[PDB]
């Protein structure tokens, strides 16, 4: 019994930490065989121009209390790419994915090339992350762990306005409308990822929590106009095909479920909680529920 | 900026965890140096766990009768003793991996992670308190047992908890590594329940002032109240009471904020008295009482915004 929001072990990760100085500036670098990948910021930015008026010697490299030799650069999208004489020999089993709005994943925030903690979170609908991160923690990664494998899917570059996050996959690429540099950028309107939020009343119904079940059902059309009002993501068949496996498991049908979330959005909480929470809960994925009252190992 | 719940690294415990076996139940152990720590109940039946006598059960063992497994490799067992609820199993190598460790006991109140084990393979990693009731509110499922609370201050790993029991709650209840339980439980199938739980008042005092660092100050009032009228008031919500040591606890984020600790603790009254009226304090609808002041200065910001 429990349910907490859960992160990945992070130790194949640790392994991969280094610190990156160029210049003034420190960041973090995730060592891979023999390259070490950071944002490349670390160098109105010309990127390309910045450069090529680097030498190799002038990227320092600190892997522990060991100096890495850089003998190669070069940058792919918003990542900068350090080919380093040493392969990594803590290097796991590993894949560069791109994740989609919605889906979870761990977070290592790092400074100076040192772990100092490790949380769980989502991609919003928005592209940005609610993330925790202060200044030394760009090039701190995302990831997730499928069996022996840890699929990288996140890089963090910066800050916004509102204290939300933005960052790139690990080959570069921004997840949302944002650009590397000091101008004025803004956050979307966000959305409620609906089938997260589905997938933890599913969760909770599993921990014996049900008072908010009821007798009736919806049609995929009615619950979308209604979720359309409330700012949640609309709710599509695959969703649906995805629970599944959880409406199975409870005897609760996807569609049943969704009349439960209609009420609870047009009546709220009433002064009672939901697995300890006043809030629907949307960081938890159908697979996160199935996953953890399971008991997967890595 | 921002605030999460927020573990600590897991990679120096999880070159620790070992899956032990002794007949036909299999749980967790914690391989540091020559020794595996784990769960004294692994040599009870379904059966022994009304009215154990380990003492009587330990003895008729053997230290073959004991598989210790890390990774695909067998470790062998060359000794074997009893300290207090804790299984203590000398093997014939030492953990390379071993980090620098000790073995600290808590107090309600503490944070500390923990990394979820099944069959001596980590699934994953959470943040908790320990309650004032002694239980924790964690996420284990049979076969958990043996898993580890720990701290990482600096390089060295604090272990602090080892989990044995599931209360009828759904709450867990466990030792420090050197066996003694947190609160009045026992390793015994007999009706054992969770004491009615508080809220960790200095804890959401700490969060309050994570809050204030972050931006945000809707809460706050132009009162301030005396220490006994503030527990007089807290006490009729299920607040723990605060003491002065919570008080001096408090005095760095006091000075950092500009917010004395008596002023923070009447928006807490207010905050008692007429709810959050739809608004969100760190992106939560409740009152957080699994961040302590240490937590909230370790995370947030030296520089308030
Ligand atoms: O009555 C019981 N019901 C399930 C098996 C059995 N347990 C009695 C018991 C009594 C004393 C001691 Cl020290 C250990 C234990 C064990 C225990 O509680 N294990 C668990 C531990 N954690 C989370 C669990 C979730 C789900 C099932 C077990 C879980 C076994
Ligand atoms: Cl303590």
Redesign the interface.
Known sequence: ????????????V??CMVQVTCGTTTLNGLWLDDVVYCPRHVINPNYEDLLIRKSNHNFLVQAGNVQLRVIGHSMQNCVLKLKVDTANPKTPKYKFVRIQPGQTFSV??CYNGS?????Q?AMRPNFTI?????NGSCGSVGFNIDYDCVSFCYMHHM?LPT???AGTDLEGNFYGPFVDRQTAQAAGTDTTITVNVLAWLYAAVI??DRWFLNRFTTTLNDFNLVAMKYNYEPLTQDHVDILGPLSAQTGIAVLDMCASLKELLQNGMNGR?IL????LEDEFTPFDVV????????
Not at 1 to 12: D, L, Y
Not at 276 to 279: Q, R, T, Y
Not at 291 to 298: K, L, P
């Open positions: 019994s429990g349910f907490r929001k859960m992160a990945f072990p992070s130790g194949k640790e392994g290592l925030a772990p100092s903690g490790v949380y979170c609610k993330g925790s991160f202060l800050e204290g939300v996050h921990n014996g909680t300890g929470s006043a809030l996953r953890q009252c399971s008991g997967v190992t890595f």
